[PDB]
Design an enzyme around this catalytic site. Structure first.
Site, PDB file in Angstrom:
ATOM      1  N   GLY B 134     -10.237   1.415  -7.360  1.00 49.05           N
ATOM      2  CA  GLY B 134      -9.621   2.632  -7.846  1.00 49.05           C
ATOM      3  C   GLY B 134      -9.977   2.930  -9.290  1.00 49.05           C
ATOM      4  O   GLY B 134     -10.218   2.036 -10.099  1.00 49.05           O
ATOM      5  N   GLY B 135     -10.017   4.225  -9.606  1.00 47.22           N
ATOM      6  CA  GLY B 135     -10.253   4.628 -10.981  1.00 47.22           C
ATOM      7  C   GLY B 135      -9.132   4.205 -11.906  1.00 47.22           C
ATOM      8  O   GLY B 135      -9.379   3.688 -12.998  1.00 47.22           O
ATOM      9  N   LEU B 243       2.411 -21.945 -15.327  1.00 49.74           N
ATOM     10  CA  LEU B 243       1.248 -21.077 -15.490  1.00 49.74           C
ATOM     11  C   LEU B 243       0.237 -21.672 -16.464  1.00 49.74           C
ATOM     12  O   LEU B 243      -0.975 -21.600 -16.231  1.00 49.74           O
ATOM     13  CB  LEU B 243       1.691 -19.688 -15.950  1.00 49.74           C
ATOM     14  N   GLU B 245      -0.157 -24.925 -17.179  1.00 45.87           N
ATOM     15  CA  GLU B 245      -0.774 -26.043 -16.472  1.00 45.87           C
ATOM     16  C   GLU B 245      -1.746 -25.542 -15.416  1.00 45.87           C
ATOM     17  O   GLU B 245      -2.813 -26.133 -15.207  1.00 45.87           O
ATOM     18  CB  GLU B 245       0.302 -26.918 -15.830  1.00 45.87           C
TER      19      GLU B 245
END
Ligand SMILES: Nc1nc2c(ncn2[C@@H]2O[C@H](COP(=O)(O)CP(=O)(O)OP(=O)(O)O)[C@@H](O)[C@H]2O)c(=O)[nH]1
Ligand SMILES: Nc1nc2c(ncn2[C@@H]2O[C@H](COP(=O)(O)CP(=O)(O)OP(=O)(O)O)[C@@H](O)[C@H]2O)c(=O)[nH]1
Ligand SMILES: Nc1nc2c(ncn2[C@@H]2O[C@H](COP(=O)(O)OP(=O)(O)OP(=O)(O)O)[C@@H](O)[C@H]2O)c(=O)[nH]1
Ligand SMILES: [Mg+2]
Ligand SMILES: [Mg+2]
Ligand SMILES: [Mg+2]
EC number: 3.6.5.-
Lengths: 46, 430, 427, 427
Positions: B134-135, B243, B245
């Site tokens: 998508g743009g 996150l 780790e």
């Protein structure tokens, strides 16, 4: 046939010149208009 | 503390976020209106009395899907300022989503993100949901990610993207946007998870024997993947994966942060009874090339690091047995410079099932996220399509007319080329 | 919010637009008096794209009805749903073009067009966030072709960043209504090359052929043709007017179907189309919609796609549908027919799916195809024009109205350049 | 309390005044016999601005009915709401001015101005706190133009601090009814320049243009034109007669629209003005009032505002409306049309909002604009006067009863000077 295409280029150039002249004349004073606001975006700390 | 913010950009991102938030509300017992008749503090902020608002944000340049959310059954969950809407769609144009249409809406979404981030005290990072095709999901995602990089900095940035399939794609100008968004995702992202719609389709057709699956099943699968990602942080487990780790164990080099996610067991109700779904067999099914949600061949790739996220009735010893059996299989090979390449995470709580969903209730489930070189081939044929379309300068004016030049097209091309060169030279033997 | 201003030029344009407004008021549940009598809120959550909220909980179209004969205006007003339009939007003269592109573009249409510009200006300023304009006109007459072309030029000058739509019916060599059709068509196509963002080439041959062999209709009048064109017009913007699994506004189709600015002439198509006697013998599934879209007979321009190469293809689907099988069908279409699709563009087909189907059908599809087979539709027009131009035939009307032969010469050169560029992108 | 004394001169002035009293008594709920039969209590606390208390709960207007021909007052009394007036306020001679400013100002105006001044003295001393006077007259005749100018002058020496408001129908080149219109118009402007605080330049040409293109009225008689003028007259004093969010009396409009004392010729207007068939299709909000009241066709003068610059404008809004919308619409008008407004006066718009709308409408606006387009309306009269004055045409009439050539010369010089200063401040 080269003369015909040279005249073609000349005619297109003349038409473009007169169209640009008309556009320049029109752009000096815009036509009266009225619409909604389109409010400006708020500024945030950054 | 220990919070993370979800960002949903584009139609794909918004629909995947709808599925994710329905799944999260089912997981934590929160009703669609926000009332819960602790551990929910990761994704939900408690407001006043008996009101939980998700730590999310919905961004679009078109008002269709956002207003669908505003009138759907979860209209009471989100406050109106959380769902940000444009006027004119980017219209599959990276230029429109990055320069012309994205510039007048970036400030407001960044203000919302700021007001959502100071509310929490332990922000782990961001979860950006978007699509490469998508743009909006390319241009505005790149713009938002670079703004987040310059603003927050060391905060982790995890993004989920819908990579175009080799054959199953619905946009003509897609390769341009896909190259352009990765040109900045290479440096503004910490870990980019990759998903192909065609691979979801193949999994739905074979494993879940759905003859006509649509986007809701795809978003349900992606929501299950994200729930398995965040379960180690939203609950307690024998082995907990955070996150930070996750990034440390999965990302060996700064530019190599594009792992492939697989989820197992994903089976129908009628096929679940006949299967004694053990830890060893779902672990084996994770490495099966038919179960990858990216249309690529791990056999011709080489594994570098994989993270095994277990949830349910799982004990570490059978996980060690399954990993040992995986190591002994010659068809699955790892790089020499990574003698140990398994990050293990066990969670007690089992994955819930959304009512009306196609998946069956399972005692155990695995979401393996392997950083392998099999995505070099994906980058390779995306680049071939990009070159083959760019040779004739097709659709280039549709980007040039919106504050954009061919020089950065070429620079994105050479950046991608350097990316395949990087993967090739890290995949070689020493 | 991404509203569209509708304009009708000429008798054919006015009738097609009236039928389009009838079918789109049926789709949005608006009665012939203008009030809302629908059942779903989805009929009103995007009512501003085509309608203006009038006082009294009722709606008026954002349409300007333009002609040079008051007779067509009276006919449109007197018919069903003709009262819904705002009376001041009815802009008309008294003389008529008389099948003279010169009278429609230089003298009489030029005299009238100031009022049309004023009305479209106030319509564009009243609305919130305009995205573009759409015009319905012919190419054989002087009112439609000439004056709509002038209107397109003026609108593009005033709104250079907005998208132009032209559901324009082109003349055809066999059902040729008038004698001066190629003159008018060439003069119109001249400025339609650059002043229009995308153009839908329709013609009466393909519509009649549909009504003969597909609909099996014994004596189709202009009403059925206009209904077909109206259905295609509605299916083009159904993504704007209704939600869906994958949305695609007109700008998205423009950027996904126009690789180079001068190639924006498309062959529209609609599916499903079945006769009354064959309605019960046909299966309700998406692959047969794809087959009905991609075959030569369903095209609404008299161009056989087998003689050319598809550049880009659009398929705006409607109804509760599955995405996997749609994508698989498009992949099979692009694979079994790789010779008929251009090779330097991978993924030649763009797919859009809307959830709200048209009334009376649970599933429908709109075909919009950009192919090099369009070039022969201009070959025939150009050769007819060249046949009448060597002998100065019928030129004295245009010359006396104020034109010159060099205008015709350069319009022909422009069409020949477009044909050459289509040929050299066909390879 | 802030009373207004109304004077009507000439046949046109008396007709417009009778219609104005019709519409005012409609606003305040006063029956044809003069007794109160309204419903809202808001119609009575400001009843004294136009009415006097008679014995037996009876209301009589503060109107002076002035003319030389008794037939005009016979018609006014015989018509509807005509018996409400005080019988001795009717003042009349026997001859008639004969379309002669000279006889309306010197020879038979003078013997009647004594009685008229006696009546207005009685009315002004009767009232509690006078604020000004209203005069309705036309510039074409001798009674209206000449005797109204004389009356204005007399009131000015007698009441110099009170505001002078006049509603003057000026002649037009298209709608020309008498041959000596330039003479009477020039001689009357020569005194309205320095004897009036605000002049509302009405003209029949613009009123007929309204009744054609705006109201779509088939056969507009003088009744409809007088109805429009009466609507404007009621709009300029609504704030005096009713409460509101922003209140603006006559003096506030005068101070907000007269940057220099000689530029007090205002171009009036009204909104909404809708056709019977078209009012059903029109949204009715503040923005559409704004776009109507600023449209050059809506204006009540035969001079295009686009040919000049707005020195100041006034928007006397009526009805329950949001102030944000009103002020924002005025802001947008000022910004997107900066070339049409004087640069040395920021905030060219004066805005007032009342809450009591005219009967039958929920909101209405009265446009008043001090533009530089009055210069051409006066140049038309000036050039007609010059054409009739080089050849001494019709001068034997005016010279026959006391006037001289130098008075005509000074009137022309004054009008030329005013045109030149409008041109100067236009820049
Ligand atoms: N598909 C349709 N074609 C139509 C319709 N009406 C006319 N036509 C065709 O269009 C062509 C002529 O278009 P018009 O009659 O509208 C010409 P126009 O009024 O625009 O110009 P002047 O006649 O010079 O005023 C010719 O082939 C007609 O048969 C209609 O309702 N539908
Ligand atoms: N807008 C209106 N104009 C009117 C009306 N009655 C007359 N007039 C116009 O007024 C203009 C001349 O004004 P009058 O005829 O009233 C002349 P007046 O009686 O003031 O002076 P004499 O008749 O010379 O004594 C002329 O153009 C008429 O058409 C009316 O009711 N409304
Ligand atoms: N898996 C999955 N992919 C989706 C879904 N919806 C859209 N996509 C993908 O998104 C791509 C196009 O991007 P969109 O999200 O539809 O649109 P966008 O991101 O808003 O950008 P624009 O094109 O400018 O509107 C398509 O190629 C699809 O493959 C979805 O629900 N599930
Ligand atoms: Mg989108
Ligand atoms: Mg015609
Ligand atoms: Mg008189």
């Amino acid at each position: 046939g080269d003369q015909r295409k040279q005249m073609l280029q000349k005619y297109k150039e003349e038409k473009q010149l007169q169209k640009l002249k008309e556009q320049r004349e029109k752009a000096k004073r815009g036509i009266f208009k009225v619409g909604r606001y389109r409010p400006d975006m708020p500024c945030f700390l950054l | 503390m220990r919070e993370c913010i979800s960002i949903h950009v584009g139609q794909a991102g918004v629909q995947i976020g709808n599925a994710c938030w329905e799944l999260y509300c089912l997981e934590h017992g929160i009703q669609p209106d926000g009332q819960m008749p602790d551990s929910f503090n990761t994704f939900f902020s408690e407001t006043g009395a008996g009101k939980h608002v998700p730590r999310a944000v919905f961004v679009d340049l078109e008002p269709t899907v956002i207003d669908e959310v505003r009138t759907g059954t979860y209209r009471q969950l989100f406050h109106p300022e959380q769902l940000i809407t444009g006027k004119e769609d980017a219209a599959n144009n990276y230029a429109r989503g990055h320069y012309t249409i994205g510039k007048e809406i970036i400030d407001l979404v960044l203000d919302r993100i700021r007001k959502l981030a100071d509310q929490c005290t332990g922000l782990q990072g961001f979860l950006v949901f978007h699509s490469f095709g998508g743009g909006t999901g390319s241009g505005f995602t790149s713009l938002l990610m670079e703004r987040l990089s310059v603003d927050y900095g060391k905060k982790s940035k995890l993004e989920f993207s819908i990579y175009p399939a080799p054959q199953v794609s619905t946009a003509v100008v897609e390769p341009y946007n896909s190259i352009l968004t990765t040109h900045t995702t290479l440096e503004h992202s910490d870990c980019a998870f990759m998903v192909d719609n065609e691979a979801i389709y193949d999994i739905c057709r074979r494993n879940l024997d759905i003859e006509r699956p649509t986007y809701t099943n795809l978003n349900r699968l992606i929501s299950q993947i994200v729930s398995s990602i965040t379960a180690s942080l939203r609950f307690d487990g024998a082995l907990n994966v955070d996150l930070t780790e996750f990034q440390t164990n999965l990302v060996p080099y700064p530019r190599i942060h594009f792992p492939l996610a697989t989820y197992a067991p994903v089976i129908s109700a009628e096929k679940a009874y006949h299967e004694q779904l053990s830890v060893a067999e779902i672990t084996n099914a994770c490495f099966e090339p038919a179960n990858q949600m990216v249309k690529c061949d791990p056999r011709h790739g080489k594994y570098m690091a994989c993270c095994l996220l277990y949830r349910g009735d799982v004990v570490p010893k059978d996980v060690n047995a399954a990993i040992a059996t995986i190591k002994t299989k010659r068809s699955i090979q790892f790089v020499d410079w990574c003698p140990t390449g398994f990050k293990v995470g066990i969670n007690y709580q089992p994955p819930t099932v959304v009512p009306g969903g196609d998946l069956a209730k399972v005692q155990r489930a695995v979401c393996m996220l392997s950083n392998t070189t099999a995505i070099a081939e994906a980058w390779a044929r995306l680049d071939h399509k990009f070159d083959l379309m760019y040779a004739k300068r097709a659709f280039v004016h549709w980007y040039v007319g919106e504050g954009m030049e061919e020089g950065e097209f070429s620079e994105a091309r050479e950046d991608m080329a350097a990316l395949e060169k990087d993967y090739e030279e890290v995949g070689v033997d020493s | 919010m991404r509203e569209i201003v509708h304009i009708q030029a000429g008798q054919c344009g006015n009738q097609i637009g009236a039928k389009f407004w009838e079918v789109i008021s049926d789709e949005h549940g608006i009665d012939p008096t203008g009030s809302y009598h629908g059942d779903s809120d989805l009929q009103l959550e995007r009512i501003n794209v085509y309608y203006n909220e009038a006082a009294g909980n009722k709606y008026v179209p954002r349409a300007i009805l333009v002609d040079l004969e008051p007779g067509t205006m009276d006919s449109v007003r007197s018919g069903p749903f003709g009262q819904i339009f705002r009376p001041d939007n009815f802009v008309f003269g008294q003389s008529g073009a008389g099948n003279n592109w010169a009278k429609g573009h230089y003298t009489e249409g030029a005299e009238l067009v100031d009022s049309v510009l004023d009305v479209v200006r106030k319509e564009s300023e009243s609305c919130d966030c305009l995205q573009g304009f759409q015009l319905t006109h012919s190419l054989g007459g002087g009112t439609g072709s000439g004056m709509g072309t002038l209107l397109i030029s003026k609108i593009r000058e005033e709104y250079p960043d907005r998208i132009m739509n032209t559901f324009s019916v082109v003349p055809s060599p066999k059902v040729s209504d008038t004698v001066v059709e190629p003159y008018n068509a060439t003069l119109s196509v001249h400025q339609l090359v650059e002043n229009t963002d995308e153009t839908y080439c329709i013609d009466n041959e393909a519509l009649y052929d549909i009504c003969f062999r597909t609909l099996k209709l014994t004596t189709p009048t202009y009403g059925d043709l206009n209904h077909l064109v109206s259905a295609t017009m509605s299916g083009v913007t159904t993504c704007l007017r209704f939600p869906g699994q994958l949305n695609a506004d007109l700008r998205k189709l423009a950027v996904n179907m126009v690789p180079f600015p001068r190639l924006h002439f498309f062959m529209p198509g609609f599916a499903p189309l079945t006769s009354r006697g064959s309605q019960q013998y046909r299966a309700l599934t998406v692959p047969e919609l794809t087959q009905q879209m991609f075959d030569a007979k369903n095209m609404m321009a008299a161009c056989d796609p087998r003689h050319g190469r598809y550049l880009t293809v659009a398929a705006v689907f409607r109804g509760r549908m599955s995405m996997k099988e749609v994508d698989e069908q498009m992949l099979n279409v692009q694979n079994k027919n790789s010779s008929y699709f251009v090779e330097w563009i991978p993924n030649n087909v763009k797919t859009a799916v809307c959830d709200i189907p048209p009334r009376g059908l649970k599933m429908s599809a709109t075909f919009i195809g950009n192919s090099t087979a369009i070039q022969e539709l201009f070959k025939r027009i150009s050769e007819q024009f060249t046949a009448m131009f060597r002998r100065k035939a019928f030129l004295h009307w245009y010359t006396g109205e104020g034109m010159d032969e060099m205008e015709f010469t350069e319009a022909e050169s422009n069409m020949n350049d477009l044909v050459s560029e289509y040929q050299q992108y066909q390879d």
